């Protein structure tokens, strides 16, 4: 039930705010857009899809950087309430190049930089684009992960009121919810 991070060793100093900042700058804006989507591009994928998975993840078109979205994730694509995604939001992991699909065994990334599992999030179909999952992932395609640091800031302090965001990876090792993972 409680918020579990992970992080290259690389980040230990870094607190969870500076490095979410950085990441959605560096992985910037798709433009998943009307008359902007670009098939290849800027649609990303479902694993297993089409339109459903236990996985959606996609690449920046601006640098290497990647995300991982898991939990049990549902597109509405035209259908009411149009272009939503809902569902369970479990995980998302953030780093660079990434690989594999449905016939794979899942998405992985070759650099995965950090992680945020137990999420707990669960957003349902009558929400449409208000819904906290549609926010905190479409957050991470357009270049603003306000909605994944709210939420995380939230289940840390529901952890221990001392931690935040702006508690750094170690600081958050020490209390017992974040876990180093190897260096690239």
Same mark, same amino acid.
């Given at each position: 039930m409680? #918020? !579990? ?7 230990? %100093? $870094? ?7 950085? $990441?959605s700058?560096? +992985?910037? =804006? ?7 989507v ?9 694993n297993?899809?089409?339109? @459903? ?7 920046s078109?601006?640098?290497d950087?990647? +995300? #991982?979205?898991?939990?049990d994730?549902?597109?509405?694509? +035209? ?6 995604? $809902?569902?369970?939001?479990?995980? #998302?992991?953030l ?13 992985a990334? @070759? ?5 945020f599992s ?11 684009? @208000? ?6 992932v479409? %957050?991470?395609? !357009? ?9 995380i =800031? ?5 952890? =221990?009121?001392?931690?935040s965001?702006?508690?750094?990876? @170690? ?14």
């Amino acid at each position: 039930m409680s #918020i !579990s991070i992970s992080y290259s060793t690389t980040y230990s %100093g $870094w607190t969870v705010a500076d490095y979410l900042a950085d $990441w959605s700058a560096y +992985f910037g =804006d798709v433009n998943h857009r009307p008359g902007q989507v670009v098939d290849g591009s800027n649609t990303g994928g479902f694993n297993p899809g089409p339109f @459903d998975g236990s996985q959606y993840a996609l690449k920046s078109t601006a640098s290497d950087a990647a +995300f #991982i979205a898991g939990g049990d994730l549902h597109y509405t694509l +035209f259908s009411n309430p149009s272009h939503t995604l $809902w569902g369970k939001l479990d995980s #998302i992991a953030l780093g660079d190049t990434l690989t594999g699909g449905a016939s794979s065994g899942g998405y992985a990334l @070759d650099s995965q930089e950090v992680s945020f599992s137990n999420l707990g999030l669960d957003s349902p179909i009558a929400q449409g684009r @208000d819904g906290t999952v549609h926010k905190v992932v479409y %957050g991470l395609m !357009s270049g603003d992960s306000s909605a994944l640091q709210g939420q995380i =800031d939230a289940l840390l302090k529901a952890v =221990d009121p001392s931690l935040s965001i702006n508690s750094t990876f @170690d600081q958050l090792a020490a209390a017992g919810v974040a876990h180093a993972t190897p260096a690239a």
